[PDB]
Design a protein that fits this description.
alpha/beta; EC 4.1.99.3; 8 strands; six-stranded mixed β-sheet; binds flavin-adenine dinucleotide; monomer; 3 domains; 7% strand; 19 helices; globular; DNA-binding
DNA sequence: ATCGGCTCGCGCA
DNA sequence: TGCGCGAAGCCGAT
């Protein structure tokens, strides 16, 4: 807990007490891959300044990439190529390790005689597993910093929040303390495996790319990765799209969303930065309220969900009323039953669902509104709730650029299990889970135009 | 003990 | 297209 005027100590918490070593401060970067507006890197620099040592950044590439597609890999890697150059300009060296973070981070601390270890915060299961391994294998102090949420996850609330309307008041009460400008990253005054080689080695490791009847389906030109690109996407949203957001956010025929989720997922841009700029923008107040609710309440309540429910991707995490309902309807005759392969290919009877899948396959980002429709029909046309959850998670994390994310698990849990929702009218197969229909969409936007844009 | 109020479909201007 | 009601279980403020 070092000094600093803009260094709120509540953003940091110790994972391991220990004797501070004589070597550099190491920032094990995982979730927040950026140089600007990064509380984890800023704290690491602050601690370094106080101990008269340099700060270095270390990043561990795991074999997880093999589970989810070329498209996520290129986006991350191309971003990291930009990050390395950015950190070089500030005289901050970056090291890239390939292996199990459990093993590799421990050995790096020992070999480079690191004095203090800092990492960013993720509520996902696997990160806590790596952390506990690292703890068992080091002697130096080990700090965690929430660089992803405006209000630190463990400060916003101490329990799983049942609904946004109970969480909203708590989060906004803490905004005045935690919504603050970022100080500039001070360069080092003391002073890696080829990212280009990791790019090729693993891009060839993926022969199972999604193709077409043999042309590849992914279109990489829709989102340019990196920290610079993210800033441009933010500024064009404020300039051109924020004003209309309140009205057109749920019309998938209009590209009127922020398009920030891919950059937000990999932490190439801070949501605190986005919030700071949106707050100062003079736009329609209704649109502001709507957007802020999405990127503050719903984004950060998703971290709450995963942090306090370690089964966040299972039926157990559903609330009792949803479990009772879905259990009661397990034997109901489904009108249609499709396999993972058939959903994946877009071979259902519903042209709207198929179009949603085609947008996902081709762009890597399904519109917000149809994601709800998409997930809920998987529940409707699967043989069991467990199978639906599997299929939804599999397709989401495999094809969404912003997948493998708390927002994904919390969003699928809303669609299928009523997490952060309430009970609705009793139906068959879906019980009391909120229903969405083809006819409903027909009333809210030009379904025909969405279908034709994606075959 | 007890209400009020929560991010759909539907009928109607 | 925008509005007001319905159906439905529970949290938290009173
Ligand atoms: C079944 C399902 C799966 C989803 N999967 C993901 C996912 O894998 N990754 C992901 O980042 N989001 C997911 N979401 C939430 C939402 O769909 C996306 O965040 C949103 O579409 C991202 O596009 P955008 O930022 O251009 O939209 P915007 O309207 O510009 O929203 C801006 C930001 O607010 C946040 N946000 C918006 N909606 C939600 C939400 N429902 N929950 C949490 N945060 C939200 C996002 O951080 C988003 O980037 C999912 C929702 C559902 C219903």
């Amino acid at each position: 807990v070092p000094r600093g005027s803009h260094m709120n100590p509540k953003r940091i918490r110790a994972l391991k007490s220990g004797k501070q070593g004589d070597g550099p401060v190491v920032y094990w970067m995982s979730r927040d891959q950026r140089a600007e507006d990064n509380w984890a890197l800023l704290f690491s620099r602050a601690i370094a300044k106080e101990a008269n040592v340099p700060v270095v950044v270390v990043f561990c590439l795991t074999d997880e990439f093999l589970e989810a597609g070329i498209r996520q890999y290129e986006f991350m890697l191309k971003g990291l190529q930009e990050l390395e150059v950015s950190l070089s300009r500030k005289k901050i060296p970056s090291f890239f390790l390939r292996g199990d973070p459990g093993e590799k981070i421990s050995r790096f601390v020992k070999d480079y005689n690191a004095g203090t270890l800092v990492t960013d915060f993720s509520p996902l299961r696997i990160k806590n597993q790596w952390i506990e391994k690292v703890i068992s294998g080091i002697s130096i102090p080990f700090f965690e910093v929430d660089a992803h949420n405006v209000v630190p996850c463990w400060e916003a609330s101490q329990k799983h929040e049942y609904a946004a309307h109970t969480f909203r008041p708590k989060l906004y009460a803490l905004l005045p303390e935690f919504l603050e400008e970022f100080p500039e990253l001070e360069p080092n005054s003391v002073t890696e495996t080829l990212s280009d080689v990791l790019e090729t080695g693993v891009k060839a490791l993926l022969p199972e790319r999604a193709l077409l009847k043999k042309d590849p389906l992914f279109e990489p030109w829709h989102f340019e990765p990196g920290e610079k690109a993210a800033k441009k996407v933010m500024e064009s949203f404020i300039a051109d799209r924020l004003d209309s957001y309140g009205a057109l956010r749920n019309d998938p025929t209009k590209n009127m969303l922020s398009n920030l989720s891919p950059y937000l997922h990999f932490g190439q841009i801070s949501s605190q930065r986005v919030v700071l700029e949106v707050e100062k923008a003079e736009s329609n107040p209704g649109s502001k309220k709507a957007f802020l609710d999405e990127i503050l309440i719903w984004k950060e309540i998703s971290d709450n969900f995963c942090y306090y429910n370690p089964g966040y991707d299972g039926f157990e995490s559903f609330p009792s009323w949803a479990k009772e309902s879905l259990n009661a309807h397990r034997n109901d005759v489904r009108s249609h039953i499709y396999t993972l392969e058939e959903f994946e290919a877009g071979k259902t009877h519903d042209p709207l669902w198929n179009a949603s899948q085609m947008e996902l396959l081709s762009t890597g980002k399904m519109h917000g509104y149809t994601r709800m429709y998409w997930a809920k029909k998987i529940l409707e046309w699967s043989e069991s709730p467990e199978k639906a959850l599997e299929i939804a998670i599999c397709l989401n994390d495999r094809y969404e650029l912003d997948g493998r994310d708390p927002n994904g698990y919390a969003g699928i849990a809303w669609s299928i299990g009523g997490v952060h929702d309430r009970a609705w009218g009793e139906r068959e197969v879906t019980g009391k889970i909120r229903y969405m229909s083809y006819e409903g969409c027909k009333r809210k936007f030009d379904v025909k135009l969405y279908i034709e844009k994606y075959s």
